[PDB]
Amino acid sequence: HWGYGKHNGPEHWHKDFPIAKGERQSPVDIDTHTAKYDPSLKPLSVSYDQATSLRILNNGHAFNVEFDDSQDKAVLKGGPLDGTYRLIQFHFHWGSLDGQGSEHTVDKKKYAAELHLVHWNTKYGDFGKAVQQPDGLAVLGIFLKVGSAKPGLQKVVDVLDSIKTKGKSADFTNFDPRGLLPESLDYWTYPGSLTTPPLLECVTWIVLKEPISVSSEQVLKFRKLNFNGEGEPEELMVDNWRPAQPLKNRQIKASFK
Numbered sequence: 001h002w003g004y005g006k007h008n009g010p011e012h013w014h015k016d017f018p019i020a021k022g023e024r025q026s027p028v029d030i031d032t033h034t035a036k037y038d039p040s041l042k043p044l045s046v047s048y049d050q051a052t053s054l055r056i057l058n059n060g061h062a063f064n065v066e067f068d069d070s071q072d073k074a075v076l077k078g079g080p081l082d083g084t085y086r087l088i089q090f091h092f093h094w095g096s097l098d099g100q101g102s103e104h105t106v107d108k109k110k111y112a113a114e115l116h117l118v119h120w121n122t123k124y125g126d127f128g129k130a131v132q133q134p135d136g137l138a139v140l141g142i143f144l145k146v147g148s149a150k151p152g153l154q155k156v157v158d159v160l161d162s163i164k165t166k167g168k169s170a171d172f173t174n175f176d177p178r179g180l181l182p183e184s185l186d187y188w189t190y191p192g193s194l195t196t197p198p199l200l201e202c203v204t205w206i207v208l209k210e211p212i213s214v215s216s217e218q219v220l221k222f223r224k225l226n227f228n229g230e231g232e233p234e235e236l237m238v239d240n241w242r243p244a245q246p247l248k249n250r251q252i253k254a255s256f257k
């Protein structure tokens with residue numbers, strides 16, 4: 001099925017997922033000069049002190065760190081959001097080289113990687129119901145640049161050897177996602193979509209302006225993962241990013257002057 005190869009990559013996805021050519025697709029280029037400051041936007045409230053991580057899974061496209069979302073433990077509120085959004089998982093997108101890997105771009109700049117913290121709107125009861133609604137999900141996007149190591153990423157990096165291939169999982173309890181945030185919560189926001197099939201138009205995107213720094217060694221270990229299953233020919237899990245999509249009839253708002 002779909003993937004990131006020449007034969008099944010983003011240019012092909014519209015054949016099985018025609019919303020790929022829809023009116024609110026993600027990611028987008030964030031033109032920093034055209035984004036408007038919206039003084040009515042609230043600070044973001046990221047409340048992760050009671051987060052319960054469970055497991056890490058190689059799903060053949062990325063790796064997901066999954067959370068217990070059966071209670072209001074790790075939630076996102078405020079900013080552009082109405083109501084309470086519960087953390088269900090995070091994952092990354094990254095490149096084969098440090099000059100590419102992010103999904104969103106900033107004045108056409110590509111970062112080495114992008115973190116997505118995925119949350120669903122509790123008014124819809126479960127994630128599967130939320131993805132059917134225009135305000136179902138809130139994804140917090142954070143850029144990664146290569147420089148100093150990110151201490152709070154190292155526990156993720158060190159478990160990757162145990163989930164090398166598609167379908168492998170590992171216990172991943174007691175991980176604190178607060179260690180993946182930058183200092184500032186300044187953000188851009190716009191209405192968009194999932195960046196992988198099914199490409200549902202259910203996401204409020206909140207993209208932080210400040211990148212986090214990770215080391216060359218940390219991102220090298222992302223690049224040792226495999227898209228393939230065990231006992232299949234090795235295809236390195238790299239360049240698992242969708243390129244920027246047309247902005248169409250959308251405005252990107254900034255939380256900051």
Ligand SMILES: NS(=O)(=O)c1ccc2c(c1)C1=C(CCC1)[C@@H](c1ccc(O)cc1)N2
Binds near residue numbers: 116118131193195
């Ligand atoms: N790169 S991203 O952060 O935009 C992203 C992409 C795909 C995803 C997810 C997050 C999580 C689910 C939907 C919401 C969040 C999952 C899915 C959705 C519905 C579905 O029927 C199958 C799987 N897929």
Ligand SMILES: NS(=O)(=O)c1ccc2c(c1)C1=C(CCC1)[C@H](c1ccc(O)cc1)N2
Binds near residue numbers: 002012017
């Ligand atoms: N619109 S879509 O992106 O979902 C899509 C695109 C290309 C495809 C397929 C579906 C599927 C293949 C076999 C099963 C499903 C195949 C393929 C090509 C190359 C490849 O590496 C793997 C599979 N042709």
Ligand SMILES: [Zn+2]
Binds near residue numbers: 091
């Ligand atoms: Zn993503």
